[PDB]
Scaffold this active site. Structure first.
Site, PDB file in Angstrom:
ATOM      1  N   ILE A 248       1.384  -0.784   1.480  1.00 23.56           N
ATOM      2  CA  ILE A 248       1.132  -0.763   0.044  1.00 23.56           C
ATOM      3  C   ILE A 248       0.685   0.650  -0.307  1.00 23.56           C
ATOM      4  O   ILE A 248      -0.484   1.008  -0.117  1.00 23.56           O
ATOM      5  CB  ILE A 248       0.088  -1.801  -0.380  1.00 23.56           C
ATOM      6  CG1 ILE A 248       0.598  -3.215  -0.101  1.00 23.56           C
ATOM      7  CG2 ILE A 248      -0.257  -1.649  -1.852  1.00 23.56           C
ATOM      8  CD1 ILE A 248      -0.369  -4.299  -0.504  1.00 23.56           C
ATOM      9  N   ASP A 249       1.613   1.461  -0.805  1.00 20.41           N
ATOM     10  CA  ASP A 249       1.268   2.791  -1.281  1.00 20.41           C
ATOM     11  C   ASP A 249       0.252   2.703  -2.416  1.00 20.41           C
ATOM     12  O   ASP A 249       0.066   1.655  -3.040  1.00 20.41           O
ATOM     13  CB  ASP A 249       2.520   3.530  -1.752  1.00 20.41           C
ATOM     14  CG  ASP A 249       3.449   2.644  -2.558  1.00 20.41           C
ATOM     15  OD1 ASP A 249       3.193   1.424  -2.626  1.00 20.41           O
ATOM     16  OD2 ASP A 249       4.435   3.163  -3.124  1.00 20.41           O
ATOM     17  N   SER A 250      -0.413   3.827  -2.684  1.00 20.51           N
ATOM     18  CA  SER A 250      -1.440   3.846  -3.719  1.00 20.51           C
ATOM     19  C   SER A 250      -0.859   3.719  -5.120  1.00 20.51           C
ATOM     20  O   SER A 250      -1.574   3.294  -6.036  1.00 20.51           O
ATOM     21  CB  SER A 250      -2.265   5.121  -3.613  1.00 20.51           C
ATOM     22  OG  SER A 250      -1.445   6.244  -3.845  1.00 20.51           O
TER      23      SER A 250
ATOM     24  N   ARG B 227       4.093   9.345  -1.035  1.00 20.29           N
ATOM     25  CA  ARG B 227       5.291   8.655  -0.582  1.00 20.29           C
ATOM     26  C   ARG B 227       6.553   9.481  -0.788  1.00 20.29           C
ATOM     27  O   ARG B 227       7.636   9.046  -0.383  1.00 20.29           O
ATOM     28  CB  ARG B 227       5.430   7.301  -1.286  1.00 20.29           C
ATOM     29  CG  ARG B 227       6.095   7.345  -2.648  1.00 20.29           C
ATOM     30  CD  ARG B 227       6.092   5.963  -3.275  1.00 20.29           C
ATOM     31  NE  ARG B 227       6.703   5.947  -4.598  1.00 20.29           N
ATOM     32  CZ  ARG B 227       6.714   4.884  -5.396  1.00 20.29           C
ATOM     33  NH1 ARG B 227       6.148   3.752  -5.001  1.00 20.29           N
ATOM     34  NH2 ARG B 227       7.290   4.952  -6.588  1.00 20.29           N
TER      35      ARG B 227
END
Ligand SMILES: CCCCCCCCCCCCCCCCCC(=O)OC[C@H](COP(=O)([O-])OCC(O)COP(=O)([O-])OC[C@@H](COC(=O)CCCCCCCCCCCCCCCCC)OC(=O)CCCCCCCCCCCCCCCCC)OC(=O)CCCCCCCCCCCCCCCCC
Ligand SMILES: CCCCCCCCCCCCCCCCCC(=O)OC[C@H](COP(=O)([O-])OCC(O)COP(=O)([O-])OC[C@@H](COC(=O)CCCCCCCCCCCCCCCCC)OC(=O)CCCCCCCCCCCCCCCCC)OC(=O)CCCCCCCCCCCCCCCCC
Ligand SMILES: CC(C)=CCC/C(C)=C/CC/C(C)=C/CC/C(C)=C\CC/C(C)=C\CC/C(C)=C/CC/C(C)=C\CC/C(C)=C/CC/C(C)=C/CC/C(C)=C\COP(=O)(O)O[C@@H]1O[C@H](CO)[C@@H](O)[C@@H]1O
Ligand SMILES: CC(C)(COP(=O)(O)O)[C@@H](O)C(=O)NCCC(=O)NCCS
Ligand SMILES: CC[C@@H](CO)NCCN[C@@H](CC)CO
Lengths: 445, 132, 450, 31, 90
Positions: free
Chosen positions: E38-40, C8
């Site tokens: 939903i990022d890890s 991210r």
């Protein structure tokens, strides 16, 4: 409670310090008989009090019977007695039937009314009358919303127009009308099929058209305009963006204008307002009190505080126009928190530490009143001490201790689980006496 | 008068000690301040200050002789005199002021015999002289 | 760990270029703080003196415990003391705060704050507007803001992964950023705000190893800045210098807090057009968001915990701003990152999908125009030499006859009358309000930045 | 014979002495 | 064996606490990174709060192979049907 308040309000009429503007208005009243008009004696090149001089006209007629200060300040005690009687018998029984039957709510309402009235309204200023006009317009708007009628809302506008003409800061009497305008319009629109919309809004503009008779009863338009122009180009005025200057004047060290009593009167009002709003937002209502008029009682105070930005002068004594709302707000706040703090052990600690921090901030000032009302007052030149320690730090360390205790009680709802506290004759005794104990202490002081 | 002018970097070099007020530090990064070591300070030759309304009420009261300051030494030891200065090409602008320090009597520095001593982290020879 | 630079982080938007290139040129042409010469002269003499003295006042008494950061500038001044070189740790810190604010704090507040572009624009522009007039000199406000942001990031990482090592490094970070200036107390707010989810970890891991193997490292971590604070000085000399500074210098006991806000409303150089944004764009975004989070409890895109901890930190910072020996306006640069993080949450909370009624959005627009009018009611002056050539450096701006704050006040009054008319008639589906009330905070911040 | 039993001692020792050594720095002889 | 509608109902109350996504979006055909953003770094928190309520250690060896909610329900189903040692004692 009525006996106690009226007694403490009648013995204050004799042994009581006057305000700063009691020699000003008295001289204006004494010299306005001749000279043809209500002149400004000490300033402004003989300009008139053109828009705001219907009260000096009455004071000029009282001053022709006797100039004794115990007789000239008589219209400022009847206003206080009427304000208290209204708060006690028209407002509290309206918010709820159970809030007026509580024997602690009435006591704390009376104590808060006294504590908010005594430091401000004991002079020849128009604030004792503005504080009565606000609370007599609120009850008329409430009498018009319920029991659907329109003439109470037409007398309320006349009273508000009489209040606006007292002083620039007197426009806060319009707040209980702006807040209830929507309900009054709901009442109006229920008559469109019977009579119409003109036969209900014409008498409401005929009431607003009374200021032109009140102001221009002795002078013309080009004279009031010249008076206002002189007062704006000569006198000291401050713009609308320096509004925090009022709250700075209230809390300033070594001043007999921000005392340890006015600070308390204002901070308790702010605490009650922003606690009632938070309880009404977090929880949907306050069980026992009707949530209809309560929202309007909170909105009236909020809009009144917001309207004080347009006034030209922003002294700290102008907070005396909220002494009618403070007495009605303290009782309902002490009634609403009695349940919020009874079923949770940390809300009580937060309440107590907020009260203690308010006490700590208030007690860091002098106890001076004015020029002559300082002869014999104990802490009139230094901040209070008990033996040698400053009492403004004991309260701070106690508030920090209470905050740590509240944090510890917050850190335990994950391990000890949600615990029901109690409901007995004692667990309800410490959950409502706060804001009564400190108010009684301040009044006795 | 038609003045004959000269720069400040050329008149005041980068070697002579100069007393700069606490406002003029980033505009003069080549002049050398008035160093101090072992409790004794050097003797300055010029004083650089901000403009009038700032020097009058912010730097002449901060560096006062009665609250530590640095103007408690130069009023006892030296005499200050204003010089005529102009900001190039922006006349009518107040850049500040430059001053000259003249000695009251001619005196040369001392020698300050030295020594050492080991304390114990709680030792205190007594309070300092602060107020009367 | 399976990698560094989590997936991210590897993203580039149009806000990154704007922020980076608008700070890298304000670093060159922009203004400076007021206490730059003060620190430069303190640092250029601290090696000949030998003890990092206070040069201009207090009988030559040192920086008592708060001097570990100036010993870095004292080392930097050995290369050169040019204004472009001695000010690097104020650009590196700005880049670090932007990196953290964009890739750790906004994605933590939910998939609705890290999915809106207006929120990113608001965060970037408010960070710029709060960093420009305050943290471009040598005053150590940007360093304290970056430390208080790193502490929050580390505590959130500890809460996420369920470990104690980031929660142990956060204590050392808070101690070290408190050891910079007495105004560094804004960093323990990040520890108080996150005490409950850390107790939830300690009381959970203590049933496998014990209490002391988890508590003693947390004590060694907290009590380690003493070896850096008391390297050259001594407790006796520290007590003596504190006695001097208290008996002479400005003390400003805690109940004199209102001076910091009294100095802001004056039309002078200290409180100017640009020196009010850092506080107004924080309060205006903090209070309505609090009142909206009180009533509503499900906003479908916002995590409750990380959103409440931020408001808790901001309020604890406003509380801890008392008890400081000096009440200046320069202490408003501490909000540079927390205001940028609060504006991005307010922009989502007041969006047409969360605030569904037209009159509430109209009232918020009125409030925005009101705070703009308050901002534009002062002079446009800078401190010492940044004031050379400014447009309105010694007068209130005027578009000819009438000021500019009056125009914004008239617009705000018109918006308030519009909101009142929507209130009376019970209307909730206006169409031009949908156009006017889409991301007003980014526009109001970009105006001030431009 | 497990390294958790060793880390548990290395965390209490050298975590308690590393804290009692930091409070003695203000109180130590200087020249 | 645990029903699918209780597995999903237990996973949704954790997803709603960690991220804030309403439990009306958690369907067995939603991807954890494309549909639900939903990022890890949030999947790790979900896998931690899963064990902190029901003792279940999902190792990072397998935390990468879960791309949809159907994968989660299949993984839980297979591990609970394989091992009869499922305590399920609160
Ligand atoms: C130039 C002016 C500049 C503008 C100023 C900027 C401010 C704008 C935003 C301000 C927001 C308004 C605040 C209102 C709070 C009070 C409302 C309330 O609490 O509820 C009761 C009451 C309504 O109760 P209700 O509907 O019966 O029932 C509630 C529902 O059941 C259920 O409740 P609900 O959901 O329906 O109610 C929620 C309500 C409650 O939720 C809350 O959030 C309440 C708490 C928020 C308020 C926080 C209190 C603020 C206190 C201020 C204190 C300041 C000093 C304190 C300082 C401390 C230290 C510094 O929140 C709101 O109402 C927000 C929308 C209101 C829009 C209505 C019209 C907006 C007019 C803008 C007002 C301008 C003020 C006069 C300016 C002078 O509130 C009102 O609706 C009254 C509004 C009507 C007021 C009309 C004002 C006149 C407009 C004319 C303006 C033109 C003047 C221009 C000057 C001309 C010169 C050229
Ligand atoms: C006067 C005030 C003095 C103290 C009295 C009240 C302060 C405490 C909060 C009031 C409660 C508000 C509320 O019910 O929200 C519930 C909120 C709802 O929780 P929830 O919905 O279940 O979800 C929670 C999350 O899941 C989970 O989140 P969490 O459970 O982890 O929450 C933790 C979060 C806590 O969450 C919070 O957000 C705390 C509340 C933050 C806002 C506080 C509301 C205050 C607003 C006042 C309204 C004024 C508005 C004015 C409007 C117009 C003005 C222009 O962080 C903290 O715990 C740190 C707390 C630090 C707050 C310190 C406040 C300092 C006072 C303000 C300083 C201003 C001084 C200016 C100088 C003057 C110069 C002129 O959570 C709390 O109950 C918080 C309880 C905190 C307990 C306090 C622990 C430490 C002791 C603090 C006392 C400070 C020493 C003095
Ligand atoms: C039109 C229509 C159809 C109807 C209009 C009526 C309605 C519906 C609304 C009217 C709202 C208005 C008119 C508000 C006016 C008040 C405002 C917002 C600003 C005031 C405007 C003016 C004319 C200011 C004049 C400047 C002036 C007279 C300054 C003097 C200050 C005064 C007189 C009092 C200040 O208060 P004070 O100074 O604290 O105390 C008093 O002053 C003396 C002591 O010095 C003593 O006599 C008093 O105690
Ligand atoms: C957390 C995780 C296992 C999963 O993240 P990913 O699946 O997005 O790669 C991986 O990103 C990781 O180990 N990150 C650690 C690196 C980090 O947090 N910061 C790097 C220096 S700030
Ligand atoms: C009146 C001048 C004031 C700032 O306005 N000086 C502040 C003192 N500066 C400190 C270092 C930043 C001293 O250690």
């Amino acid at each position: 409670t009525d006996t106690g308040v009226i007694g403490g309000l009648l013995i204050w009429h004799i042994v009581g310090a006057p305000t700063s503007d009691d020699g000003y208005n008295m001289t204006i009243a004494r010299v306005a008989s001749e000279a043809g008009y209500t002149t400004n004696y000490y300033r402004y090149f003989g300009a008139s009090e053109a828009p705001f001089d219907w009260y000096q006209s009455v004071l000029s007629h009282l001053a022709s019977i006797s100039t004794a200060g115990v007789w000239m300040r008589l219209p400022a005690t009847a206003a206080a007695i009427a304000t208290w009687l209204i708060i006690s018998r028209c407002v509290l029984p309206r918010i709820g039937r159970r809030v007026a039957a509580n024997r602690v709510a009435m006591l704390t309402a009376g104590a808060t009314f006294l504590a908010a009235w005594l430091p401000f309204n004991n002079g020849l200023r128009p604030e004792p009358l503005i504080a009565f006009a606000v609370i007599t317009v609120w009850m008329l708007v409430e009498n018009s919303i319920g029991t659907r009628r329109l003439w109470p809302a037409a007398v309320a506008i006349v009273i508000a127009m009489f209040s606006v003409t007292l002083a620039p800061q007197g426009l806060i009497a319009l707040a209980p009308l702006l807040v209830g305008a929507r309900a009054i319009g709901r009442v109006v629109t229920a008559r469109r099929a019977g009579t119409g919309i003109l036969a209900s809004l014409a008498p409401l503009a005929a009431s607003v058209a009374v200021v032109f008779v009140i102001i221009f009863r002795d002078q013309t338009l080009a004279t009031v305009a010249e008076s206002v122009r002189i007062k704006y180009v000569v006198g000291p005025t401050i713009p609308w963006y320096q509004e925090f200057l009022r709250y700075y004047f209230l809390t300033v060290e070594d001043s007999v204008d921000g005392s340890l009593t006015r600070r308390f009167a204002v901070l308790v009002l702010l605490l009650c307002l922003f606690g009632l709003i938070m309880v009404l937002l977090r929880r949907g209502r306050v069980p026992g009190a009707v949530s209809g008029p309560l929202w309007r009682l909170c909105g009236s105070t909020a809009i009144g505080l917001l309207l004080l930005i347009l006034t030209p002068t922003k002294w700290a004594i102008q907070f005396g126009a909220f002494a009618g709302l403070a007495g009605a707000l303290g009782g309902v706040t002490a009634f609403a928190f009695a349940r919020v703090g009874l079923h949770s052990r940390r809300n009580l600690a937060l309440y107590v530490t907020a009260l203690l921090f308010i006490l700590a901030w208030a007690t860091s000032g002098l106890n001076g009143w004015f020029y002559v009302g300082n002869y014999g007052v104990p802490w009139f030149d230094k901040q209070p001490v008990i033996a040698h320690y400053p009492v403004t730090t004991i309260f701070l360390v106690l508030a920090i201790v209470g905050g740590l205790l509240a944090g510890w009680l917050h850190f335990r709802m994950d391990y000890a689980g949600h615990t029901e506290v109690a409901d007995t004759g004692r667990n309800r005794a410490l959950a409502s006496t706060p804001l009564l104990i400190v108010a009684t202490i301040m009044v006795v002081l | 008068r038609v003045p004959e002018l000269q720069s400040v970097q050329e008149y005041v070099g980068s070697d002579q000690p100069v007393l700069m007020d606490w406002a003029v530090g980033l505009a003069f990064p080549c002049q050398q301040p008035m160093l101090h070591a072992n409790g004794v300070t050097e003797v300055p030759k010029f004083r650089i200050s901000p403009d009038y309304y700032a020097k009058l009420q912010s730097t002449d009261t901060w560096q006062d002789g009665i609250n530590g300051g640095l103007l408690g030494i130069t009023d006892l030891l030296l005499r200050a005199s204003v010089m005529s200065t102009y900001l190039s090409q922006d006349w009518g602008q107040d850049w500040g002021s430059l001053r000259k320090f003249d000695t009251v009597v001619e005196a040369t520095p001392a020698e300050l015999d030295f020594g050492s001593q080991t304390h114990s982290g709680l030792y205190s020879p007594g309070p300092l002289r602060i107020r009367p | 760990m399976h990698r560094l630079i989590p997936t991210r982080w590897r993203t580039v938007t149009a806000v990154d270029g704007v922020v980076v290139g608008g700070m890298a040129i304000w670093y060159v042409i922009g203004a400076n703080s007021s206490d730059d010469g003060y620190i430069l002269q303190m640092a250029r003499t601290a090696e000949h003196a030998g003890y990092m003295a206070n040069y201009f006042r207090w009988f030559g008494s040192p920086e008592d415990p708060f001097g570990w950061y100036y010993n870095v500038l004292a080392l930097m001044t050995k290369v050169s003391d040019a204004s472009i070189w001695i000010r690097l740790p104020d650009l590196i810190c700005a880049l670090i705060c932007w990196l953290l604010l964009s890739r750790e704090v906004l994605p933590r507040l939910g998939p609705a704050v890290a999915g809106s572009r207006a929120a990113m624009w608001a965060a970037g522009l408010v960070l710029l507007g709060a960093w420009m007039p305050f943290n471009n000199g040598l005053r150590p406000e940007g360093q304290i803001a970056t430390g208080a942001l790193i502490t929050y990031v580390l505590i959130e990482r500890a809460v996420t992964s369920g470990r104690l090592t980031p929660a142990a490094l956060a204590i050392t970070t808070a101690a070290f950023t408190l050891g910079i200036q007495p105004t560094g107390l804004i960093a323990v707010a990040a520890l108080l705000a996150g005490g409950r989810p850390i107790l939830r970890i300690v009381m959970r891991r203590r049933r496998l190893v014990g209490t002391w193997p988890l508590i003693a490292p947390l004590l060694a971590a907290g009590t380690v800045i003493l070896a850096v604070v008391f390297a050259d000085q001594t407790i006796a000399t520290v007590l003596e210098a504190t006695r001097i500074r208290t008996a002479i210098g400005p003390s400003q006991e805690w109940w004199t807090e209102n001076l910091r806000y009294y100095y802001l409303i004056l039309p002078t150089t200290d409180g100017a057009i640009s020196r009010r944004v850092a506080f107004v764009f924080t309060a205006m975004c903090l209070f309505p968001s609090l009142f909206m989070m009180l009533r509503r409890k499900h906003i479908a895109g916002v995590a409750r915990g990380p959103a409440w901890r931020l408001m808790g930190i901001i309020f604890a910072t406003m509380f801890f701003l008392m008890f400081t020996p000096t009440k200046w306006i320069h202490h408003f640069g501490l909000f540079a990152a927390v205001g940028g993080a609060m504006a991005a949450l307010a922009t989502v909370l007041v969006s047409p999908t969360v605030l569904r009624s037209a009159r509430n959005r109209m009232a918020f627009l009125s409030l925005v125009l009101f705070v703009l009018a308050f901002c534009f009611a002062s002079t446009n002056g800078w401190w010492y030499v940044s004031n050379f050539g400014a447009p309105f450096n010694n007068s209130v701006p005027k578009v000819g006859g009438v000021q500019i704050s009056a125009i914004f006040f008239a617009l705000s009054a018109i918006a308030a009358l519009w909101a009142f008319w929507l209130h009376l008639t019970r209307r909730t589906e206006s169409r031009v309000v949908d156009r006017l009330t889409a991301a007003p905070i980014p526009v109001a911040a970009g105006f001030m930045v431009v | 014979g497990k390294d958790v039993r060793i880390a548990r001692w290395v965390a209490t020792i050298a975590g308690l002495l590393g804290f009692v050594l930091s409070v003695s720095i203000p109180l130590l002889p200087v020249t | 064996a645990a029903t699918q509608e209780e597995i999903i109902a237990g996973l949704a109350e954790i997803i709603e606490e960690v991220t804030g996504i309403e439990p009306s979006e958690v369907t067995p055909e939603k991807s954890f990174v494309d549909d639900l953003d939903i990022d890890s770094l949030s999947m790790v928190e979900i896998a931690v709060q899963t064990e902190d309520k029901y003792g279940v250690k999902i190792p990072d060896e397998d935390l990468a192979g879960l791309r949809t909610v159907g994968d989660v329900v299949a993984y839980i189903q297979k591990l609970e049907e394989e091992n009869p040692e499922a305590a399920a004692a609160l």
